[PDB]
Symmetry: C2
Subunit: 120 residues, 2 copies
């Protein structure tokens, strides 16, 4: 039996590029990525699953935006940021990234959900 991780996605994220990470593992790796995420970024599942999402950053990504995300994760709060991200072919897009924490019944942090929206 494989856990249905998508059973935790909001209504808005259903047809979206979305990823879940596991902050209890070293380096906060992705444990689920939606097909829309893979289509947008140009990766196969094996290329991104189990990796920290920093692979989306590239040479002109703003380092303060990266640190803002890092601090937002440590705060365990809902936050959104516009950040320059890159596909496998090196093309760049402005990503409106929305992150939210997901807790277990005891109240301990369990996952992060991150939804990607290219800014048009």
């Amino acid at each position: 039996d494989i856990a249905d991780l998508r059973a935790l996605l909001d209504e808005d994220e259903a047809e979206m590029s979305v990823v879940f990470s596991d902050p209890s593992q070293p380096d906060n790796p992705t444990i689920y990525v939606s097909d829309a995420f893979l289509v947008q970024t140009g990766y196969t599942l094996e290329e991104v699953l189990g990796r920290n999402c920093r692979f989306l950053q590239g040479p002109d990504t703003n380092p303060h935006a990266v640190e803002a995300i890092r601090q937002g994760l440590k705060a365990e709060t809902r936050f959104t940021i516009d950040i320059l991200n890159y596909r496998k072919d090196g093309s760049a897009f402005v990503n409106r990234l929305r992150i939210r924490p997901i807790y277990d019944p005891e109240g301990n942090l369990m996952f992060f959900a991150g939804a990607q929206n290219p800014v048009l």
Copy 2:
């Protein structure tokens, strides 16, 4: 947002005593227990959440059955065993315990699900 852990329970477990444990945490603690489990065993949620399920064992529980469960968990396979368990008031009941592993998309073990059925 609290994860809907019950979104991973089978059809049979829905009205059942069921618990989920997190084997990635030290001592494989419970992270979800159903109300039917709490009613059967006589505990409040705060008394059992975050604890290893060994609190259900008592003075006449068979130590080989306990070790069989331990080995079955290490095998990461589906298994069922009849084991003597105890409620908070010290009364005993034969528990038909069914355990199954739950994996993440990458194929790594994620949770154990355990369903309890008193043998009548």
